[PDB]
Every structure is written in C-alpha cells, then in structure tokens.
Amino acid sequence: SKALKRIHKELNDLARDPPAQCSAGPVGDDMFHWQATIMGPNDSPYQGGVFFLTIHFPTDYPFKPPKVAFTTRIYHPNINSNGSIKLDILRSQWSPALTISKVLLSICSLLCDPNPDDPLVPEIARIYKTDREKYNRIAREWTQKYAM
Amino acid sequence: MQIFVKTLTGKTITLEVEPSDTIENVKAKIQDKEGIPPDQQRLIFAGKQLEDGRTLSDYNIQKESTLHLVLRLRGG
C-alpha cells in the first residue's frame, strides 16, 4: 500500500536527522502502529519527564492524518487527561506534505507554547493564562508523578 | 437565588442568578467567577443543552439547580 511505502520514507527520514529529544518508531510487527517519546523541554514545567505517545497511521495515510495521543498523563491546556491532543495539524490543517517529524515538532512546540485561547481543557487554559506560576507548579508536579 | 455549575474537572461553581437571567448572562457570570470565555462554555441541564437567548425560567432552573459545564469545541 502507498501508506506503507510512505511510512518507511518518514521512518528513514527520522533516522537521517533525528529531532533532538524526540524519538519514534513502530511498536512491533505493525508498521502502522508507532510509539513516540517526547522529553519534557528544559525550561518548561515538563523538564525531566518522558512523555509517551501512541501514533497510528490510518489506512488512508497520508490523505488523512496520523492519530496521535499521549499515553503519559500531562497537565496542559490542549491535552486532556485521556491524552487527546487538540492541535490543528492533527485535524483541520493536516496536509499530506506534513511528516511525522513535523507532527512531533508541533507537539513539542505545543508543550512549550500552549494555545490557551483555543483549549481542550478550559480550566487549565485559564490557569495558564492568568496564573502561570500555578500552571507551572501543577505541571511540574504532574511531570514528577506521571512522567518520571 | 443560587444555582450550581458542576465542571468536568470536578469543581462546583455557585452562581447568584435570577429566574429572568438569560443563558448568555449565566455564561457571563461563569466567566466572572472562573475566567472561561462564554464561547468555550456548553451548559447542560435536565437533558438539554442551554441556548443563549432563553432564560433560566425557560428551562425551569429553580433554586439550587445543578447545571453541567462542558467544553464548546467551536470555541476551543
């Protein structure tokens, strides 16, 4: 299938220039099923954490986006407690020109720079916007309990 | 009178409201107490999504009624 050939090209790309503090690859015998790790960015409340994601490439990839969710609990305005990620390139702004490397870099950007004006968890979004110190101390505690 | 708004993270917001307050007004009061913009607010009561442009009495929200606050994804 054209999806399988595509997924191999992107995995080879990731092996050419691996993005720092971001790795990903198939979980086992299923090339459509990947797992990723995001290292919590230093100078973020997530520093020191390792955040696991599941990635699934649908059969119609790359015309539909990869399905990506955190399996590590993370405290974030755009990520609910189920690991569902509200990010435009995973839905309405997906383009077959995008790669899983760009998707991972976008999630790393979301962790350091949330979109609280279009949140998935409005309470956390308000905490982030109006009380950043509180947002940080909760996200650090969650990093410590769940990502370490 | 006081109505309760239960959120998904487990908070219970108590609002001081009037039967004639509109849903738009209730959402504004939630924005006042919790900071959530109205366009992120989806209010549920007695099996119904509450529409802006009806009042609390339109849905028979009486004293100490309990509303549920969920995300309106269009605003998020």
UniProtKB/Swiss-Prot annotation, chain A:
Segments forming domain UBC core: 2-148
Result for mutant: K64 to A/E: Strongly reduced interaction with CNTO4
EC top class, as a word: transferase
Gene Ontology molecular function terms on file: ATP binding; ubiquitin conjugating enzyme activity; ubiquitin protein ligase activity; ubiquitin-protein transferase activity
UniProt-reported outcome of changing E123K: Abolishes histone H3 ubiquitination
Gene3D superfamilies: Ubiquitin Conjugating Enzyme
GO CC annotation terms, alphabetical: cytosol; extracellular exosome; nucleoplasm; nucleus; protein-containing complex
SUPFAM superfamilies: UBC-like
Impact when changing K145E: Abolishes histone H3 ubiquitination
Record carries keyword Nucleotide-binding: yes
Known EC number: 2.3.2.23, 2.3.2.24
Subunit organization: Interacts with SCF (SKP1-CUL1-F-box protein) E3 ubiquitin ligase complex. Interacts with CNOT4 (via RING domain). Interacts with E3 ubiquitin-protein ligases CBLC, PJA1 and PJA2. Interacts with PDZRN3. Interacts with PPP1R11. Interacts with E3 ubiquitin-protein ligase PHF7; the interaction inhibits cleavage of PHF7 and promotes association of the complex with the nucleosome core particle.
Family: Belongs to the ubiquitin-conjugating enzyme family.
Protein name according to UniProt: Ubiquitin-conjugating enzyme E2 D2
Organism of provenance: Homo sapiens (Human)
UniProtKB/Swiss-Prot annotation, chain B:
Covalent cross-link site, Glycyl lysine isopeptide (Gly-Lys) (interchain with K-? in acceptor proteins): G76
Topology with respect to the bilayer: Peripheral membrane protein
Disulfide bonds: none
Effect of R74K: No effect on ADP-ribosylation
Phenotype when changing S65D: Phosphomimetic mutant that binds and activates PRKN
Effect on the protein of changing T7D: Impairs ubiquitination by CRL2(KLHDC3) E3 ligase complex
Effect noted on mutating R54D: Decreases affinity for UBE2R2 in CRL2(FEM1C)-UBE2R2 complex
Modified residues (ADP-ribosylglycine): G76
Residues annotated as site: Interacts with activating enzyme: R54, R72
Residue(s) carrying Phosphoserine: S65
Modification sites for (Microbial infection) ADP-ribosylthreonine: T66
Top-rank taxon, per record: Eukaryota
Impact noted for substituting H68G: Loss of DTX3L-mediated polyubiquitination of histone H3 and H4
Localisation: Cytoplasm; Nucleus; Mitochondrion outer membrane
Function: Exists either covalently attached to another protein, or free (unanchored). When covalently bound, it is conjugated to target proteins via an isopeptide bond either as a monomer (monoubiquitin), a polymer linked via different Lys residues of the ubiquitin (polyubiquitin chains) or a linear polymer linked via the initiator Met of the ubiquitin (linear polyubiquitin chains).
Name recorded for this polypeptide: Ubiquitin
Source organism of the structure: Homo sapiens (Human)
UniProt gene name: UBC
Whole-protein coverage range: 1 to 76 of 685
